[PDB]
Amino acid sequence: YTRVVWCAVGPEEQKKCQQWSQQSGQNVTCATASTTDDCIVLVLKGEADALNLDGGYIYTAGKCGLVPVLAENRKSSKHSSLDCVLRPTEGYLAVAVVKKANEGLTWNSLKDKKSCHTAVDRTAGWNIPMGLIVNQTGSCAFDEFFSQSCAPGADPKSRLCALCAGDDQGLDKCVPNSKEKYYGYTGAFRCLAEDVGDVAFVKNDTVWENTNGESTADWAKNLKREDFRLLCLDGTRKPVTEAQSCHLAVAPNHAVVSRSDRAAHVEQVLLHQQALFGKNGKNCPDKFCLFKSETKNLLFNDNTECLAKLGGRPTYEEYLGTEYVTAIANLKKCSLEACA
């Protein structure tokens, strides 16, 4: 009754959710689906209560009537006075990243190169870059722009899936979940770093969390920030320390969504769960930490300080902001359960 069914996407999120479930005394339970879109349907049906979603999916979920409940909040320098849960969200920086040794590559010469995206329909991996390109290009043929790409969630037989790798056994190629090797923020950066693609569309934090010894991960043990460059909209290349003057846009933080009729309940439970397993929670380091998953960003992003209340009880459009919402609509003109 006062229990919440979390929806996990893929088997790695399933295992993490199962651990959370066990540590919660069954206050949290788990439903699992192969894609985020499916998890969304599970929530609409009332078979699942909630999940955390990137902005692009919140637009999908919002049209079907789901609402924003609480947002991911990472630690910041400004607004230091307020507590994390009451602290305003800041938004993340969407960037395009390349190897510095790849001289001569700029925003203006991306056509026909190889791209690495977090997944179709996500903010920094798809909506922002492809929105910009369709525009600058006056064409809806975003599938013919790059020569080859890894964009999880596209047709496995298309060039958009040419560079995706699948799992250990080469199965599940291009599925939009963590079984795909190049899925998500981490997977797209790895696609760039192993030199599978020429550019990766992720967010600023990703570059920082996987270089200069921050990851220990085999593929990233030896990655140095100086070996990378951000591509700016004015045709310039800059070091990753200049993300504030060289980004594609500021994205709205990922947020937990649920059915509006379940919102108050989902909110209550999560605030208590984070007091127990959050950053400074009663049992985090010692028993279970909600916001940790070895650089894999399972259920929540690993750099999450807390889940914050929203303020102004915003609809989904208000949460994403008028700038972002029109960007998506315009892109969608190129391309229930599509409820509107």
Ligand X SMILES: *[C@@H]1O[C@H](CO)[C@@H](O[C@@H]2O[C@H](CO)[C@@H](O[C@@H]3O[C@H](CO)[C@@H](O)[C@H](O)[C@@H]3O)[C@H](O)[C@H]2NC(C)=O)[C@H](O)[C@H]1NC(C)=O
Ligand Y SMILES: *[C@@H]1O[C@H](CO)[C@@H](O[C@@H]2O[C@H](CO)[C@@H](O[C@@H]3O[C@H](CO)[C@@H](O[C@H]4O[C@H](CO)[C@@H](O[C@H]5O[C@H](CO)[C@@H](O[C@H]6O[C@H](CO)[C@@H](O)[C@H](O)[C@@H]6O)[C@H](O)[C@@H]5O)[C@H](O)[C@@H]4O)[C@H](O)[C@@H]3O)[C@H](O)[C@H]2NC(C)=O)[C@H](O)[C@H]1NC(C)=O
Ligand Z SMILES: *[C@@H]1O[C@H](CO)[C@@H](O)[C@H](O)[C@H]1NC(C)=O
- Positions in 256-315 near ligand Y (CB under 6 A): 303
Q: Is 323 in the site for ligand X (CB under 6 A)?
A: yes
Q: Is 2 in the site for ligand Y (CB under 6 A)?
A: no
The partner in contact with residue 77, picked from Zn ion, ligand Z, ligand X, none with C-beta cut-offs of 5 to 8 angstroms by kind, is: none
Give how far the C-alpha of residue 246 lies from the chain's centroid of Cα atoms, to the nearest Å. 20
Helix, coil or strand: residue 307: strand
In the structure encoding, which two tokens stand for residue 173, read together? 């190629």
Residues 6+ apart with CB under 8 A from 225: 207, 208, 211, 212, 239, 240
Output 233 or 276, the one with its CB closest to ligand X. Answer: 233
Over the window 271 to 310, marking each residue x when it contacts Zn ion by CB under 5 A and - when it does not, the resulting string is ----------------------------------------
Looking at the DSSP bridge assignments, the partners of residue 68 are 257
CB of 334 to ligand X, least distance (A): 11
CB of 327 to ligand X, least distance (A): 4
Strands 228-231 and 92-99, sheet pairing: antiparallel
Output 5 or 249, the one with its CB closest to Zn ion. Answer: 249
Output 208 or 288, the one with its CB closest to ligand Y. Answer: 208
CB of 229 to ligand Y, least distance (A): 14
In this chain, which of 326, 332, 335, 337 binds ligand X, going by CB under 6 A?
Answer: 326
What b/e string do you get for 294-310 counting C-beta neighbours within 10 Å, with b at 16 or more?
Answer: ebbbbbbbbbbbbbbeb
Judge whether 300 and 284 are in contact, CB under 8 Å. no
The annotated binding site is made up of 54, 92, 118, 122, 124-125, 185, 254
